[PDB]
Design a binder for these strands. Structure first.
Ligand SMILES: [Mg+2]
Ligand SMILES: [Mg+2]
Ligand SMILES: [Mg+2]
Lengths: 152, 152
DNA sequence: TCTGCCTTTTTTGA
DNA sequence: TTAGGATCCTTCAA
DNA sequence: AAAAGGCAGA
DNA sequence: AGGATCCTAA
């Protein structure tokens, strides 16, 4: 586990509270045990003119990647262990996204159990609902209620 | 001078590079000496549901105020002396907006002289142009060249 | 089955 | 005349 | 910013 | 985010 230095984390926590996004999703998928899978994504968006800043961020975090979507680019981190390690260290300095980060950490820690039982899966889905409720969510479709309905 | 805590400045520098703005303007107004004046503004924008974060910023910076503009709110600092003191302290920690901050400080140091001469005002006006060039400027109208039609 | 990465869209919150 | 504040707008960069 | 849908390797 | 324009009291 990479240890990040404090001044880096302090600055990055400010930048993330501004331009970053901690995204939790429930995605239908017929080949998963409960017909859904979870996705947890840390993203930082910036105008492509400033892609260099996201490229520097890949070097600094040591994991993740940058993708261009024409006018804007995004630093993305999904791999679960590195995401856990990174958010564990960032979260104490977050002010606006602190609660999202800690929910993602709780989800991650419970993933093994979530995959064992429908009730446990549903409960972790409600934690995803709570993250979306904290974000400025506007286009969300699949919720823990969606999952529950697939009771059956 | 109010001296700001390092951990505060680091976090805020990150938050500023993300959601903040360092704005320099030339405003036409026929009741001023050179038919224009300079306006320098430090701004942090946020959705009004998170206005409390901006209100907190007024207490932490010790000066400035928050304006509600409907769906979003803005922390604003204009008063030239505390602006100079604040930017002086924040600038070392800025990564995207360091040059804008240093141009504002440069302009602020010359504000006394800038009336002295038509030549010198015009020069300071080009420093305003340079801040706008660094920003993601899209609606700018009055530039140093507008001023130069002081050639009458 | 499961995870990470690829692609694209929506609607603001800057 | 001036500085600081008030109001409104545009176009994205999140 | 914050989702949506989808592929394919492990 | 990054402007443009208008108000007003000292
Ligand atoms: Mg933001
Ligand atoms: Mg930004
Ligand atoms: Mg932003």
């Amino acid at each position: 586990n990479t240890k990040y230095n404090k001044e880096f984390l302090l600055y990055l926590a400010g930048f993330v509270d501004a331009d970053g996004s901690i995204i939790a999703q429930i995605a239908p998928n017929q080949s998963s045990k409960f017909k859904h899978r979870l996705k947890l994504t840390f993203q930082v968006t910036q105008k492509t003119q400033r892609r260099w800043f996201l490229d520097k961020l890949v070097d600094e975090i040591g994991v993740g990647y940058v993708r261009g979507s024409g006018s804007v680019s995004n630093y993305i981190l999904s791999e679960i262990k590195p995401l856990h390690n990174f958010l564990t260290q960032l979260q104490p300095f977050l002010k606006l996204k602190q609660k999202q980060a800690n929910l993602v950490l709780k989800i991650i820690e419970q993933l093994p159990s979530a995959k064992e039982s429908p009730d446990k899966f549903l409960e972790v889905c409600t934690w995803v609902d709570q993250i979306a409720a904290l974000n400025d969510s506007k286009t969300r479709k699949t919720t823990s209620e969606t999952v529950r309905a697939v009771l059956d």
